[PDB]
Write a protein that binds this ligand. Structure first.
Ligand code: 57D
Ligand code: 57D
Lengths: 810, 810
């Protein structure tokens, strides 16, 4: 139908149809008489998968022959979403498959909706890993994603009586056609035991063994015939495990629990033993695989020339002492040489400055689970602190500040400190964030080793986040400037010359309207909720957090409602306010915020005086597949974290690419987005980082704002008195108390500027032509935020490898 | 190479080769450069599986169209073994695949050895179910095997220091290419809860739900294009199961433990809750499937006309009250009508008279787990006992003897009594066994309902147990009488006219020698054990039991050794005595017997004076695949259970078909085997059932035999004094004590006749021509013992269906 979706050739369509029928018959063991939509989905998935394997085999053969430097991206999370459409897009098969299925009497879009998300992540960190894999393949790097194959991903969120309920994400129930089990490459991982010192070094003995079984998933590059691998480890008990008889077999579950479930925490550290086991499991299995592949190329001098290991946050930090363990205890290298190799191999990406997200593991846990690693960590610490003492003589407090070992009630190991010590490169994820690292939390480390500290501003893949989710926009862009921008997003700048083009303005606005209509239709069909498609779509989708300030959004919503009630017959720009996202199951305040949002909807959506001028909807079960639906439909993107708290954000970039305007604080990547688009084309409000610092030195008193802002006072009175919860008057007492007395994120301080700024948004929306012109200026300058740009910078400045757009032979 | 293995056509070989390469590439994601023997096995398995599916789909379509009466074979065990060669044989693909693999540079026999046994059974009972499935498909019956997909089958047996060690049979580790998961047909099963009585009947409420997910395996008939289904249920937790968060997800294992492991007990009842859950799980899921299929044909009058349910032992006995529950509580039928339907639908096969194998479930377990079923069982009992009282007025002890409820310290339900009450047909598994049932343990029930009681002598499939495991013998038979005997084993009688044929005598003896050479080679390669291929191969393979009397064999072995030591320079017929089989992990005496056998080998195999005249070998890890190797190699088959204890035996039939002579008591099917072959062609010894009864009335005193038999005395002295265990002199005290004071199976009483009979075996073996002539008379009269005969009798006399040899269109 549309150009960017590829060609539908006669030979191709015929071949796809016959292979579809072959899989339905031989693979699924069905005939057309009993086949369900799900069977049809699987037949198509297997048909498309066939096209990958030839390219997959030859790519990996190519790497074996050429022996390039290998990039190993270690992450506890890979938030992949659905795979079918992505694979079709990257293989240029979308139109041919659409035609083939059409001729078989099937609707491909209906089949696409059957696939479960691979929800092996919490949010931003896991989705960044997924975009990175896509860009690494597109840029022709010999890259491998390594993680854990969780049996259960991020929970499915149900809303019951306005409250979040959690249910298991049984994503593998019907099978996963994309993965290939590799039981032949199973590796042992050791836990517990004790350290024996001999004449020839230390030995780790009397351990318990868990097997790590790999499952490989293909990662196709964009139309370059490159297919890289994501290898995810699954936990298996050895066959002599605990070997009365029946109980011993049943107890195998204990070992296999390691890969059972993803911890559902976003930017929060939970110091549980199972989590530590997960972290070592991925690291130990992965490093064996790396060393095996390196030896199959004695001399570990060339190790850093052939291997790069990227640590996605501190979660895989145990790679540092594990690599030391293998090199010193098993390969018999001297400490100094092993350390040189380790430092030159490892690089670390920091994702947040927030204290509650920082991994600080109790010594007593490491002592029991990983006794040899603790000894190695102690030795690293001593040698590192000797360097600090020599560089800064007499500075005793610096020594305590920089130690990997934190003294206190319970001794802990600071994993971020471990990562900096054992990595040649440390990066933040946006310019402001990287500067904060050097100025605040890692200031001491920066003073010792300034050369280690870098910036790599985050990005998103334009394949999933434009071509896939918004084909209508991709097409009208391609009509003007060609197709090359899909792997060279900087070309979008060419759209600046169309800002006064009357045809383009109309087309951009048309695509947005169609997207809004399609999303409004989705809401009625799947959730029976009614929304006005002519209203401004005001959306905030992201994990529920105090720092992300869904609460500030709530206060604006109530302000709008109160203003309408005061002057019912005054015209206001109609809005649909949509808020979605999951709360960590144990995060009480976040769960209260979800209840607040639904409670506001209950009042606002049923007030006859409001009509269709204001609607508040909670978007249930926010996940990658839902993001692909709502983001193209958005008019206004809410990026309103307290300045200095959101390291980068990536949702912000997704909205910018898809024709929404942004209301936001000068936080994370918002700063660079405003810089690229021009501040006149961005709705910036509120405190800057410097203003927050000034307020902190003075002391934040929320009462001051309550006393001086009558509109804010009314809202707090409504919340406290039970306006939004008549049958439970004190339901929101926890929220009010937090706001008034212990608000670390200064919601009240940004309220006035936020409300004022929102008025300017409504004013612009009244002028459709000028709204759309500003949109064009945003889309046109979104190029910097391609993960292709990000990965090219990692490649050149950290990994020491050169990206390539050259095709492999098909 | 050989005729019975089919044709190797030019078109077929070319097509097999190309599909082999297709699967290696697209299915396994490998190329020839990195592929291992295991990869090659899987590529072949997938290639052969392809040939099944067309036939599988059309068979099941045929049943839907014709709507014949359906046979449901319910078993907790299906001892399937390997599937690759069996599938090739039944599809006439063996020679073509042999050719195709040969041209690819592969040895098919090497590839066959890679497949794991599907060891979902303990021994005879589970293997009977497997042979039955094969015969039902071969006879064109619309039959379904229903059971449990155990994650772990019967344990792998290792011998360490002469003792049995158990390890988990992780049979699914590399995947199972034969099964097809059917998650779309998942069904709920209920446990616990309570019974509420309403105005409209009883209701079972507040239950816990476990999901039953079916996996289907094709069962091909012999060259008739019929492919039936074996459906095995797997346990799955519902997604809201226990839904802090992490623990709730981990606790899903508790529900899924139901299908985790096969109870490793052979002819022994262990009254554990997990086992009861397994029994209800299979019954509840299966019955829903049956009723669904029946409705998709209100009127349950025709239910017995369209459905037969066969209970393999009492393990699935809960089918009776479950069917009543569904008909009364859910379909709202009156009790009397529901009962009439149930009785006419269900039939029960008894497998043993031994008291310790009889299922007697504590009432308190059923009360908690299945409260509604207990109420139904009580009601069945009351109505049944009212019939007994009316038939036998005043006979108060009969009422207590016949009750389904057994009073005592703990009240129990006798499941055998439940089965007889609720079945229209009850059968034993050999003539002597069926007569014992009517005379002894079920005498009361026979007096009330004589028409219910039948015999169905067991059998074995000649496909697996001749054509597959012994192609050399199958070929020389086919050369004389054609191929029709493979599905009409009675035709073997035609071989009686070749008993004086000098060419046939030579060929029969040649095939045996080749088999012995091949097995002697297997032993050296896989276990590094040396055996003399010119010796008499004396084998006893079966589960280790007191009743099966491996101990009597041990006593003969020691007698032979002592006799050689007394007269070293006297000629004796050289023997290799092989004993193999698993012991239940908790069965102390059986574990002691294994140790005894190895302990005897340790002395005998290393005595220089013995030389190669006597060797004692314990065959490790006896299972279906090993049976297929050792049985064709056997000269002498040991079937030496105490008269009245082995209900039938099936191993006996396997040896008879494969050219071994039998030494045995008049027990189980041995009686009918001797009747068929003629007693002159069988080595019969020892007490008959009548002699055991006489000894029991008198009282068995083992001391009498010890005192009167000097050779027996010597052995007991050797055992007690530590001749076979010098470093642990009293190691075998438990065995000696049992033999002397509490031997329920009268080992000493059959000793003299056994030893005498063994001398006659050695005498015959000295005359190769006369040995072989007797062998021919055994093979020629083994026809009755085909499971095709057995199944035809079930079909005509129990199920009310007519078997068919007619081909379905290919
Ligand atoms: O997931 C959480 C995130 C934060 C949290 C709070 C402020 C800044 C960053 C993270 O706090 C928590 C507190 C809890 O008791 C339980 C939780 O699961 C969380
Ligand atoms: O598997 C067993 C079979 C018999 C057994 C004994 C005599 C006749 C039939 C079965 O006894 C046992 C006793 C135990 O303590 C444990 C067991 O696992 C078994």
């Amino acid at each position: 139908q549309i150009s960017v979706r590829g060609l539908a050739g006669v030979e191709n369509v015929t071949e796809l149809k016959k292979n579809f029928n072959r899989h339905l018959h031989f693979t699924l063991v069905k005939d057309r008489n009993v086949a369900t939509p799900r069977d049809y989905y699987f037949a198509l998935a297997h048909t498309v998968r066939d096209h990958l394997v030839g390219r997959w085999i030859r790519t990996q053969q190519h790497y074996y022959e050429k022996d390039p430097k290998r990039i190993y991206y270690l992450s506890l999370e890979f938030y992949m979403g659905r795979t079918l459409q992505n694979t079709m897009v990257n293989l240029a098969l979308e139109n041919a498959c659409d035609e083939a299925t059409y001729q078989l009497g099937l609707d491909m879009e209906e089949l696409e909706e059957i696939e479960e998300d691979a929800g092996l992540g919490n949010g931003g960190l896991g989705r960044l890993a997924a975009c990175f894999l896509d860009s690494m393949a597109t840029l022709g790097l010999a890259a491998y994603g390594y993680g854990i194959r969780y049996e259960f991903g991020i929970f499915n969120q149900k809303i019951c009586g306005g409250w979040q309920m959690e249910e298991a994400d049984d994503w593998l129930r019907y099978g996963n056609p994309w993965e290939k089990a590799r039981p032949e490459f199973t590796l042992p991982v050791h836990f517990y035991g004790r350290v024996e010192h001999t004449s020839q070094g230390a030995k780790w003995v009397d351990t318990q063994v868990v097997l790590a079984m790999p499952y490989d998933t293909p990662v196709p590059g964009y139309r370059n015939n490159v297919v890289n691998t994501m290898r995810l480890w699954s936990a298996k008990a050895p066959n002599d495990f605990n070997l009365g008889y029946i109980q011993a077999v049943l107890d195998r579950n204990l070992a296999e629990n390691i890969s059972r479930v993803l911890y559902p925490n976003d930017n929060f550290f939970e110091g549980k033993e199972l989590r530590l086991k997960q972290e070592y499991f991925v690291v130990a299995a992965t490093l064996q695989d790396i060393i095996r592949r390196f030896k199959s190329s004695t001399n570990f001098d060339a190790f850093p020339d052939k291997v790069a290991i990227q640590l996605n946050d501190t979660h895989p930090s145990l790679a540092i002492p594990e690599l030391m363990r293998v090199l010193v205890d098993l390969e018999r290298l001297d400490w100094d040489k092993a350390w040189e190799v380790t430092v030159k191999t490892c690089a670390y990406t920091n994702h947040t400055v927030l204290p509650e997200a920082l991994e600080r593991w109790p010594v007593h846990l490491l002592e029991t689970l990983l006794p040899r690693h603790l000894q190695i960590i102690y030795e690293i610490n001593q040698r590192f602190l000797n360097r600090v003492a020599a560089a800064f003589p007499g500075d005793v407090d610096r020594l305590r500040r920089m130690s990997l070992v934190e003294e206190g009630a319970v001794k802990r190991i600071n994993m971020a400190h471990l990562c900096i010590a054992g990595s040649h490169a440390v990066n933040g994820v946006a310019r402001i964030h990287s500067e904060i690292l050097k100025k605040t939390i890692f200031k001491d480390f920066y003073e010792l080793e300034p050369h280690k500290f870098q910036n790599k501003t985050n990005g998103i893949t334009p394949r999933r986040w434009l071509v896939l989710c918004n084909p209508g926009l991709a097409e009208i862009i391609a009509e003007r400037i060609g197709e090359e921008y899909i792997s060279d997003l900087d070309q979008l700048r060419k759209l600046l010359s169309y800002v006064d083009d009357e045809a383009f303005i109309r087309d951009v606005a048309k695509v947005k309207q169609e997207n809004k209509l399609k999303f409004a239709a989705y809401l009625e069909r799947e959730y029976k909720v009614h929304i006005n498609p002519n209203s401004l779509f005001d959306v905030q989708v992201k994990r529920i957090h105090e720092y992300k300030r869904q609460l500030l959004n709530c206060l604006h919503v109530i302000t709008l409602y109160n203003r309408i009630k005061k002057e019912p017959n005054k015209f206001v720009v109609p809005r649909t306010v949509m808020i979605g996202g999951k709360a960590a199951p144990g995060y009480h305040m976040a769960k209260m915020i979800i209840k607040l949002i639904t409670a506001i909807g209950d009042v606002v959506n049923h007030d006859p005086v409001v009509g269709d001028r204001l609607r508040v909807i909670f978007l249930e079960n926010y996940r990658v597949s839902l993001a692909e639906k709502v983001i193209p439909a958005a008019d206004l993107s809410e990026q309103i974290s307290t300045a200095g708290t959101e390291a980068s954000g990536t949702g912000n970039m997704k909205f910018m690419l898809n024709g929404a305007l942004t209301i936001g604080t000068m936080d994370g990547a918002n700063v660079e987005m405003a810089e690229e688009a021009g501040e006149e084309n961005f709705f910036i409000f509120g405190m800057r980082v410097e203003d927050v610092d000034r307020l902190d030195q003075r002391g934040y008193n929320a009462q001051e704002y309550y006393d001086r802002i009558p509109e804010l006072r009314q809202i707090i009175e409504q919340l406290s008195s039970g306006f939004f919860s008549p049958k439970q008057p004190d339901l929101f007492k926890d929220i009010v108390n937090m706001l008034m007395h212990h608000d670390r994120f200064k919601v009240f301080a940004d309220y006035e500027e936020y409300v004022k700024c929102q008025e300017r948004v409504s004013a612009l929306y009244k002028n459709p032509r000028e709204w759309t012109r500003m949109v064009i200026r945003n889309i046109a300058t979104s190029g910097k935020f391609s993960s292709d740009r990000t990965i090219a910078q990692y490649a050149r400045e950290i990994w020491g490898v050169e990206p390539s757009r050259q095709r492999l032979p098909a």
